Design a protein around this nucleic acid. Structure first.
Length: 1322
RNA sequence: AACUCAAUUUGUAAAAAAGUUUUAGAGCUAGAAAUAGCAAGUUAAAAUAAGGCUAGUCCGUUAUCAACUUGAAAAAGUGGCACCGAGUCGGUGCU
DNA sequence: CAATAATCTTTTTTACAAATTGAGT
DNA sequence: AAAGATTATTG
């Protein structure tokens, strides 16, 4: 009889077998292979280590981007096919030259100048048009005919890099003068309000509305110049619209619901129509003048510089940039010549430095260029004008930059359209394809249709209603964007868990809301004078109340139910009502929504149209796109008014319920033949409801529901990080093997335990603008300094105290406290959602509770402001303010300390279910579950407190045994807990308030000998703990603390690192320039890396043992070899397909095919003196040994480093009394290193660095001695520091030695082993 | 088990802007030559996992993997127990 | 051969679905 | 976002 302990983690799984005396058994295990060893002894304890499981994210981003690349390529193909025939008459090789532009002249089949084909013309082109934008501008303004070649380039440039689709609608090319168009908004507005004009005299519109400021502040700055206007008044909200904000016009015109408008959304034109249909079209001209301002404000926000008008402002601006670059460089060159000759070569030549040379030809970012040039600019005169251009980031600008991410596609569309309109008179095929070409640029596959696949994509869902090849032009006529738009969502939505083949209804299904109202009503009871008993509402009464009350009001009150049904219908002068207090919770909200819209109660109440209304709601919840909703609702265009349809297309429902239609109003009761909703409408006098009906043995629902319905598959479908899903799956396989080790005798118990800058800035950055604090202007910042908690708080708090209405000085953060909102004595939560930065932690109030009612009544206003800006969370806000809602009650405080010991977590309970269902599988007579194995769950607090309480301290850095020790202690503490308190199986096994406080507080006291409670008392419970009901002995504090002490010291713990084939990217992604080296990899088959460059450093999927011959010398005489060869990820399938041919294509002859050994990463070899090594690749090794340090040096290292009860004399006694343990440890390390590590040069450094610091304090030495275990740790060599002496790593940069050693094939527990001696091969 | 709100984690789709790499933007004067002085520099094309077959405006980096036997695969099957002891596991006895 | 040092693809937006946890009901 | 394998250059 035995029990298994398990410690489940991201990178590890620890396990242990124990018996009823808490002892770890041992066994001798068969050993297989070709050695003489046929048996070996091992302890049934151990751990399993493995690299983290990765999420699918990076994999997805890479695939998403591949599609993007493929589609940009086709955009050009489309455009090249159009020019094809007509381009052939001008240049039968032009497109061929563009393709071949990458190849070197040695490999070019056509002339080497791509555009024209000679050199005199080509050199002349770049002089007239130094940039592609010079050509774009010219092809916009000029009226002369143009070379067909030059038309293509500009057009393809706009199509290749087409800009974003974040703004909807057209842009007007004329709307460009912000000053002019602003006066026209004012003039338009004053035409409407002649009584209260706006005087825009002397208001610099272009200055304020086109400044490089936030659009919020630009609004504020504008309004500031208009005495009279409110920021949220009509003109303010119109300027808000113009500036790209999203204002709300409800107060403006006194209207019902919020009517927000944003010019950039797909809905503005519909949402403006709905507002004009509410205030009158006398405002039509007013909202147009704002739209025209939005266009001109957008431009100024796009261009770094302003240009005298052109139909090509984007290009014209970059010409102004290149032009500005040329004159400022011409200036700076001659400027450095005449003031700093000792630098000109470092600045304009040395690509290794961050001057202008590294700026252009080197790899210097614009920021690095400015960070280098800025001091040099200050040192010289005639400069001040250029440092302005520097700090505005307009100094020597390139045109293709990171900033261009904001150019919307419309801008590129305008130029493309203009060019087409100039040259279509000369070139007829341009005229006929003007819309075709325009569609290549604007067309965008909708996110809801997805990959345009044809049945060979696990990612695609789209349906085709034709079958021809989809193009940007036939898209709407070949793709059923609508059916696929519905698939898009139905793939991901859930099914009814009661009927797992049925889709769940929308959250706003009328059937659902009916179902809810009745399920609430059927349990309402009434009595009054003359009734023996309370009474349910009969069928006739409920139906009456739903028609009478719920189908006229959205919320039905208890007042109405008494007065409008009971009094007016039932004559009941008075009545008492139970089953609903205050008001009903359910509502027919969707019914009232549609009634307020289509305005036909007969059409709503007639059950004939039930399916129509439900399809309307489905459409409104199944879709988000404007166009998609309209196309699906026009099915009801012959049924509803046009004004009705228009307001229908705007309503939107979000949400999906958990029940299906067939469930609520579909399945019957055979017997009675009525549905669940039928039952809810009338159920005799019983008046059952939903929960009682699905569980009612009297009624056939229960039978039919459980009449519905792999392992790794079952684990992949859990919710949780893929890292934990990896550990979980190995956890199960470990159990599955331990049972085989124990003779297929299932255990008694299984104890499981599961381990628990850029983002910070924008949180701050967003928060400060909602409050408009100048606080950053006052106190500048940096993204990397924000991982100092105190500093990060100072900004989240806006530099003000959380508990007193004073502010905080930034310079005295070390004196300010960081206080737990809920005290750590209840729940540990050292995160920002539970901490504040205050001048004194005493100003919260009593330390034993949440912030004082006083403090809330003083600070709630500020806290609310802090939440409005999203600088605290709602979680944080509720905790800050709980005082005014009762504070932490004495029973609440009991829940927090209970939660410290009972695993709440769902994922962990899913783990318990899988094991419990894998073990317990036999059933009994009455069809109940026979529980042979009890699965216990615990939180890490139990064992980690157990360690500290009983001198079993864990030091992680020493080795990996601690994962295995944690699993052992978990089996111990877990089975013992169920031993002493079997009544606690409810909270720990799968299947007056101060009582619960002191109980879970003194949960583990029965381990201790003498208990000291803080109320002044000694209470020594006896030497043997034993159950009250049960007679079974539980815990002999004499034997069993030594039984534990002995296990934790066993020097043999099965440490296994999971062997894994490496997958993922072929190599480092960096594209390196041409060198002469066999290590470069071609980017394309015909692209010689010696000529074109390529990739580098490929990831080895697995190494393989090659025992063959290779031609040696010029005589081609074969020389036997036993090498290890690395099979690249990219190389893998070619090798796997025909290994022998693969190996011969590398120069291997007479390959012994039978001896080819696949050696994945971390494959284990043991050599002399028990020295073990692991494969890191075909020519790198890892350390394979664990250092079995004796426990007494561990606890000493733990205590001598943790120099921070009165029982600490009993702990600090031990360090100074045992200061000799240092020199013992250093050689415990040394004796080990000289045996297995073999890092002679670095071992000296350790000895010479320990000896030098022996004078230092006992604590400084203990800590730094813990660093040294890095030299001895299993795995890959790493650097480490002693004091401040850095010791670089000794790496094992050859694999030759392992080929004559012993390969150790390891079971998941390590207990089963196959040992192969590799010197027996060859 | 319900509801509301909010955060978190996971999974999918559609987009944009960079970065890199080869080529094209005739470098000129001197000097036999290396070397020197000058002039320029901002742009473009193309590739962006090699590639694959199923040929799509699709797919190609997640999950899963000791050994041996059997399987297309998923996966199944394969290894005696007690005591004493403990530097990575030894030793002793039993069928 | 061993020591030593250098390198490592990045940023941004829209749309949706699911658990899951934590605080209010 | 480091880890740690690959690459190259130097003792």
């Amino acid at each position: 009889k035995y029990s298994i302990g398990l410690a489940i983690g991201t990178n590890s799984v620890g396990w242990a077998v124990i018996t009823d005396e808490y002892k770890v058994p041992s066994k001798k295990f068969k050993v297989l292979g070709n050695t003489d060893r046929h048996s070996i002894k091992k302890n049934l304890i151990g751990a399993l280590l493995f690299d983290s499981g990765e999420t699918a994210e990076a994999t997805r981003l890479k695939r998403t981007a591949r599609r993007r690349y493929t589609r940009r390529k086709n955009r050009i193909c489309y455009l090249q096919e159009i020019f094809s025939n007509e381009m052939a008459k001008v240049d039968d090789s032009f497109f061929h030259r563009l393709e071949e532009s990458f190849l070197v002249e040695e490999d070019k089949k056509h002339e080497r100048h791509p555009i024209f084909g000679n050199i005199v013309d080509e050199v002349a082109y770049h002089e007239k048009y130094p940039t592609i934008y010079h050509l774009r501008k010219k092809l916009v303004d000029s009226t002369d005919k143009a070379d067909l070649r030059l038309i293509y380039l500009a057009l393809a440039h706009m199509i290749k890099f087409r800009g974003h689709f974040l703004i909807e609608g057209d842009l007007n090319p004329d709307n460009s003068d912000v000053d002019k168009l602003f006066i026209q908004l004012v003039q338009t507005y004053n035409q409407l309000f002649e009584e209260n004009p706006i005087n825009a005299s002397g208001v610099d519109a272009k200055a304020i509305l086109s400044a490089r400021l936030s659009k919020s502040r630009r609004l504020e700055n504008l309004i500031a110049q208009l005495p009279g206007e409110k920021k949220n008044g009509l003109f303010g909200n119109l300027i808000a619209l113009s500036l790209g904000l999203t204002p709300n016009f409800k107060s403006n015109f006194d209207l019902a619901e919020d009517t927000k408008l944003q010019l950039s959304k797909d809905t503005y034109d519909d949402d403006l129509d709905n507002l004009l249909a509410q205030i009158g079209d006398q405002y039509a001209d007013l909202f147009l003048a704002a739209k025209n301002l939005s266009d001109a404000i957008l431009l100024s926000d796009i261009l770094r510089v302003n240009t005298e008008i052109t139909k090509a402002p984007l290009s014209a601006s970059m010409i102004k940039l290149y032009d500005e670059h040329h004159q400022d460089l011409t200036l700076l060159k001659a400027l450095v010549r005449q003031q700093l000759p000792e630098k000109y070569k470092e600045i304009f030549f040395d690509q290794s430095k961050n001057g202008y040379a590294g700026y252009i030809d080197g790899g210097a970012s614009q920021e690095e260029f400015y960070k280098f040039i800025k001091p040099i600019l200050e040192k010289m005169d005639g400069t001040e004008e250029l440092l302005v251009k520097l700090n505005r980031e307009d100094l020597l600008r390139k045109q293709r930059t990171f900033d261009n991410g904001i150019i919307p596609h419309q801008i590129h569309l305008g130029e493309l359209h203009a060019i087409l309109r100039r040259q279509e008179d000369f070139y007829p095929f341009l005229k006929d394809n003007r819309e075709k070409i325009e569609k290549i640029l604007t067309f965008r596959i909708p996110y809801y249709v997805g990959p345009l696949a044809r049945g060979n994509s696990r990612f695609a869902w789209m349906t085709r209603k034709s079958e021809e090849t989809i193009t940007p032009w036939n898209f709407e006529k070949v793709v059923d964007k609508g059916a696929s738009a519905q698939s898009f969502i139905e793939r991901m939505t859930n099914f009814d868990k009661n009927l797992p083949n049925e889709k769940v209804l929308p959250k706003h299904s009328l059937l659902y809301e009916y179902f809810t109202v009745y399920n609430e009503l059927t349990k309402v009871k009434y009595v009054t004078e003359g009734m023996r008993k309370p009474a349910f509402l009969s069928g006739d009464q409920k139906k009456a109340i739903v028609d009478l009350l719920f189908k006229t009001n959205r919320k039905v009150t208890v007042k109405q139910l008494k007065e409008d049904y009971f009094k007016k219908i039932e004559c009941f002068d008075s009545v008492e009502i139970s089953g609903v207090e205050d008001r009903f919770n359910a509502s027919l909200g969707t019914y009232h929504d549609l009634l307020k819209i289509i305005k036909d109660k007969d059409f709503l109440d007639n059950e004939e149209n039930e399916d129509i209304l439900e399809d309307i709601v489905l459409t409104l919840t199944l879709f988000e796109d404007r166009e998609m909703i309209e196309e699906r609702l026009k099915t009801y265009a012959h049924l509803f008014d046009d004004k009705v349809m228009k307001q229908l297309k705007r309503r939107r429902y979000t949400g999906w319920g958990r029940l299906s239609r067939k469930l609520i109003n579909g399945i019957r009761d055979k017997q009675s033949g009525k549905t669940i909703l039928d039952f809810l409408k009338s159920d005799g006098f019983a008046n059952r409801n939903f929960i009682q009906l699905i569980h009612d043995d009297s009624l056939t629902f229960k039978e039919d529901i459980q009449k519905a319905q792999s392992l790794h598959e079952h684990i992949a479908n859990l919710a949780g990080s893929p890292a934990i899903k990896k550990g979980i799956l190995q956890t199960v396989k470990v159990v599955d093997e331990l049972v085989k080790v124990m003779g297929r005798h299932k255990p008694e118990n299984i104890v499981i335990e599961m381990a628990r800058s850029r983002e910070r800035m924008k949180r701050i950055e967003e928060g400060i603008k909602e409050l408009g604090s100048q606080i950053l202007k006052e106190h500048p910042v940096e993204n990397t300094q924000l991982q100092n908690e105190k500093l990060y708080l100072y900004y989240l708090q806006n530099g003000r105290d959380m508990y007193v209405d004073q502010e905080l000085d930034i310079n005295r953060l070390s004196d300010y406290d960081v206080d737990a909102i809920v005290p750590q004595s209840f729940l540990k939560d050292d995160s920002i959602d539970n901490k504040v930065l205050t001048r004194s932690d005493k100003n919260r109030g009593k330390s034993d509770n949440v912030p004082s009612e006083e403090v809330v009544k003083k600070m709630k206003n500020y806290w609310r402001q802090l939440l409005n800006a999203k600088l605290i969370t709602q979680r944080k806000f509720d905790n800050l303010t709980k005082a005014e809602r009762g504070g932490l009650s004495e029973l609440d405080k009991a829940g927090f300390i209970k939660r410290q010991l009972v695993e709440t977590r769902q994922i962990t309970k899913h783990v318990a279910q899988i094991l419990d269902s894998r073990m317990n599988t036999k059933y009994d007579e009455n069809d109940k579950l026979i529980r042979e194995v009890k699965v216990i769950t615990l939180k890490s607090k139990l064992v980690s407190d157990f360690r500290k309480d009983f001198q079993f301290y864990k030091v992680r850095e020493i080795n990996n045994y601690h994962h295995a020790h944690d699993a052992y202690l978990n089996a111990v503490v877990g089975t013992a807990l169920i031993k002493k308190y079997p009544k606690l199986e409810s909270e720990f096994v799968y299947g007056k308030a101060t009582a619960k406080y002191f109980f879970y507080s003194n949960i583990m006291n029965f381990f201790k000998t003498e208990i000291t409670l803080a109320n002044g008392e000694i209470r020594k419970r006896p030497l043997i703990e034993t159950n009250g009901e049960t007679g079974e002995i539980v815990w002999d504090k004499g034997r069993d603390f030594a039984t534990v002490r002995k296990v934790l010291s066993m020097p043999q713990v099965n440490i296994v690192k999971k062997t894994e084939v490496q997958t993922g990217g072929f190599s480092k992604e960096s594209i390196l320039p041409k060198r002469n080296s066999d290590k470069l990899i071609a980017r394309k088959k015909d692209w010689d890396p010696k000529k074109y460059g390529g990739f580098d450093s490929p990831t080895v999927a697995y190494s393989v043992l090659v025992v063959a011959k290779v031609e040696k010398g010029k005589s081609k005489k074969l020389k036997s070899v036993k090498e290890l060869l690395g099979i690249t990820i990219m190389e893998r399938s070619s090798f796997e397909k025909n290994p022998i041919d693969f190996l011969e294509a590398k120069g291997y002859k007479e390959v012994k095919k039978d001896l080819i050994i696949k050696l994945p990463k971390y494959s284990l070899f043991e050599l002399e003196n028990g020295r073990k090594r692991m494969l890191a690749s075909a020519g790198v090794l890892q350390k394979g040994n664990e250092l079995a340090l004796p426990s007494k040096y561990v606890n000493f290292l733990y205590l001598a480093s943790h120099y921070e009860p009165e029982d600490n004399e009993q702990k600090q006694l031990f360090v100074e009394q045992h200061k000799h343990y240092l020199d013992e440890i250093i050689e415990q390390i040394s004796e080990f290193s000289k045996r297995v590590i073999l890092a002679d040069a670095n071992l000296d450094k350790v000895l010479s660095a320990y000896n030098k610091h022996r004078d230092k304090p006992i604590r400084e030495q203990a800590e730094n001695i813990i660093h040294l275990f890095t030299l001895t740790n299993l795995g890959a060599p790493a650097a480490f520091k002693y004091f401040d002496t850095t010791i670089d790593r000794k790496r094992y940069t050859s694999t030759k030695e392992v080929l004559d050693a012993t390969l150790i094939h390891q079971s998941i527990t390590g207990l089963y082993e196959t040992r192969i001696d590799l010197s027996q091969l060859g």
